[PDB]
Write an enzyme that holds these catalytic residues in place. Structure first.
Site, mmCIF file in Angstrom:
data_model
loop_
_atom_site.group_PDB
_atom_site.id
_atom_site.type_symbol
_atom_site.label_atom_id
_atom_site.label_comp_id
_atom_site.label_asym_id
_atom_site.label_seq_id
_atom_site.Cartn_x
_atom_site.Cartn_y
_atom_site.Cartn_z
ATOM 1 N N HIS A 177 -11.893 -1.669 1.934
ATOM 2 C CA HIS A 177 -12.575 -2.372 3.133
ATOM 3 C C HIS A 177 -13.340 -3.475 2.551
ATOM 4 O O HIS A 177 -13.527 -4.656 3.067
ATOM 5 C CB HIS A 177 -13.289 -1.494 3.813
ATOM 6 C CG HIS A 177 -12.739 -0.562 4.738
ATOM 7 N ND1 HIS A 177 -12.836 -0.422 5.989
ATOM 8 C CD2 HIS A 177 -11.555 0.536 4.463
ATOM 9 C CE1 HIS A 177 -11.888 0.576 6.423
ATOM 10 N NE2 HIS A 177 -11.215 1.061 5.631
ATOM 11 N N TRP A 234 2.301 2.580 -2.391
ATOM 12 C CA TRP A 234 1.660 3.046 -3.444
ATOM 13 C C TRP A 234 0.058 3.232 -3.109
ATOM 14 O O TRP A 234 -0.307 4.089 -3.664
ATOM 15 C CB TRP A 234 1.972 1.948 -4.757
ATOM 16 C CG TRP A 234 3.613 1.793 -4.868
ATOM 17 C CD1 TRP A 234 4.474 2.764 -4.547
ATOM 18 C CD2 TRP A 234 3.981 0.785 -5.558
ATOM 19 N NE1 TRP A 234 5.763 2.188 -5.155
ATOM 20 C CE2 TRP A 234 5.404 1.058 -5.869
ATOM 21 C CE3 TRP A 234 3.730 -0.328 -6.031
ATOM 22 C CZ2 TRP A 234 6.635 0.233 -6.155
ATOM 23 C CZ3 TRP A 234 4.566 -1.342 -6.742
ATOM 24 C CH2 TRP A 234 5.979 -0.972 -6.863
HETATM 25 CA CA LIG Z 1 -15.095 -8.234 0.621
#
Ligand SMILES: [Ca+2]
Ligand code: HEM
Ligand SMILES: C[As](C)(=O)[O-]
Ligand SMILES: C[As](C)(=O)[O-]
Ligand SMILES: [Ca+2]
Ligand SMILES: [Fe+3]
Ligand SMILES: [Fe+3]
Ligand SMILES: [Fe+3]
Ligand SMILES: [Zn+2]
Ligand SMILES: [Zn+2]
Ligand SMILES: [Zn+2]
Ligand SMILES: [Zn+2]
Ligand SMILES: [Zn+2]
Ligand SMILES: [Zn+2]
Ligand SMILES: [Zn+2]
Length: 319
Positions: free
Chosen positions: A47, A164
């Site tokens: 994130h 992956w």
């Molecule tokens: Ca960032």
């Protein structure tokens, strides 16, 4: 080079990491265990890094999700991430490395605690973040495969590379998808970095482990487990299904591709020729002890084979 305490590393500049390693191993990872904080820290690397779009902006793996937490943590797709950010902040304040470096370092350390896991290449020297990520850059579990592949592709990942990277879901749980059952894992082995995730996502769904109408959730094959709608689709969609199945009982591929692709993600927005290679400070991961297999009471007839070219592999069942 030999650091003040006798530990060695190829580049002396990497020496400052050793006390940070010891601190996080005890105080973030509960004594070098592959648990909740490992999982959250690995999520955090994504994130942070995926906040990167040639058209919209965002500096990638830059520590923005900590530096600009007040903005980034209120994005819907970042639900639940405030917990780990708040846990990492004091380490970043205390020690002398940038938040971008810290996030990637904590993620690579944590993953190295997991049996079957890998040493993700680690580079030191990222500058402090200089912008928040734009919203709408982090894939969401109710996004289409087209949408996810387009987003990840925008950031530079091919479809096989998305598969992956989703080996991460082998050591992962959800807290916000169904808040009635927070902490429910995506595979039966959330403290082992193995191919169980790719096997169990391929099973016929049977039940909702919590409540039944949560956005972005699909039926799970097992009471102790939650399935994302995004993972349900990637395991089955013609674009990704054959790569997905190829991970099953292919631990060497999982290891080698996860580490290489995580390194590429860790370097989004950065330039490794201006950074220093400190990969040798990351601990040696433990090995797997036995083969991934079907849960008790399942058989191959419970597998929704989705790859036209190649039969799903024989597996044993925990009896
Ligand atoms: Ca960032
Ligand atoms: C490709 C699209 C992806 C989607 C749609 C997706 C979606 C999600 C969702 C919905 C959660 C649970 C959040 C919560 O409710 O607590 C989650 C957890 C997590 N994700 Fe993924 N993710 C994706 C890719 C990735 C990648 C590339 C990584 C690589 C680091 C990653 C690592 C993790 C980890 C380790 C967790 C566990 C967090 C915890 O245990 O609290 N994810 N993801
Ligand atoms: C554009 As999106 C990754 O928030 O569906
Ligand atoms: C409604 As959306 C584009 O944030 O998945
Ligand atoms: Ca697992
Ligand atoms: Fe803040
Ligand atoms: Fe949580
Ligand atoms: Fe098992
Ligand atoms: Zn803990
Ligand atoms: Zn937590
Ligand atoms: Zn320090
Ligand atoms: Zn959006
Ligand atoms: Zn979306
Ligand atoms: Zn969690
Ligand atoms: Zn499709």
């Amino acid at each position: 080079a030999t650091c003040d305490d006798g530990r060695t590393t190829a580049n002396a500049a990497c020496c400052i990491l050793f006390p940070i390693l010891d601190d996080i191993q005890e105080n973030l990872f509960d004594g070098a265990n592959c648990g909740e904080e490992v999982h959250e820290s690995l999520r955090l690397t994504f994130h942070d890094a995926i906040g990167f779009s040639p058209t919209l902006g965002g500096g990638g793996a830059d520590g923005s999700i900590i530096a600009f937490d007040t903005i980034e943590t209120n994005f819907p797709a970042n639900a639940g991430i405030d917990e780990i950010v708040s846990a990492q902040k004091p380490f970043v304040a205390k020690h002398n490395i940038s938040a971008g470096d810290f996030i990637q370092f904590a993620g690579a350390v944590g993953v190295s605690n997991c049996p079957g896991g890998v040493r993700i290449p680690f580079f030191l020297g990222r500058p402090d973040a200089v912008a928040a990520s734009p919203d709408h850059l982090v894939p969401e579990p109710f996004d289409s495969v087209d949408s996810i592949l387009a987003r990840m592709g925008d950031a530079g990942f091919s479809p096989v590379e998305v598969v992956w990277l989703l080996a991460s879901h082998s050591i992962a749980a959800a807290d916000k998808v169904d808040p009635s059952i927070p902490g429910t894992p995506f595979d039966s082995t959330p403290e082992v970095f193995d191919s169980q995730f790719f096997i169990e996502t391929q099973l016929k769904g049977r039940l909702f482990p919590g409540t039944a109408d949560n956005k972005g959730e699909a039926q799970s094959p097992l009471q102790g487990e939650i399935r994302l709608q995004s993972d349900h689709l990637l395991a089955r969609d013609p674009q990704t299904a054959c790569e997905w199945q190829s991970m099953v009982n292919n631990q060497p591929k999982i290891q080698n591709r996860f580490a290489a692709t995580m390194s590429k993600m860790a370097l989004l927005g950065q330039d490794k020729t201006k950074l220093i290679d400190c990969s040798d400070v990351i601990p040696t991961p433990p090995a797997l002890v036995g083969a991934a297999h079907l849960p008790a009471g399942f058989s191959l007839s419970d597998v929704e084979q989705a790859c036209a070219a190649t039969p799903f592999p024989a597996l044993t069942a925990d009896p």
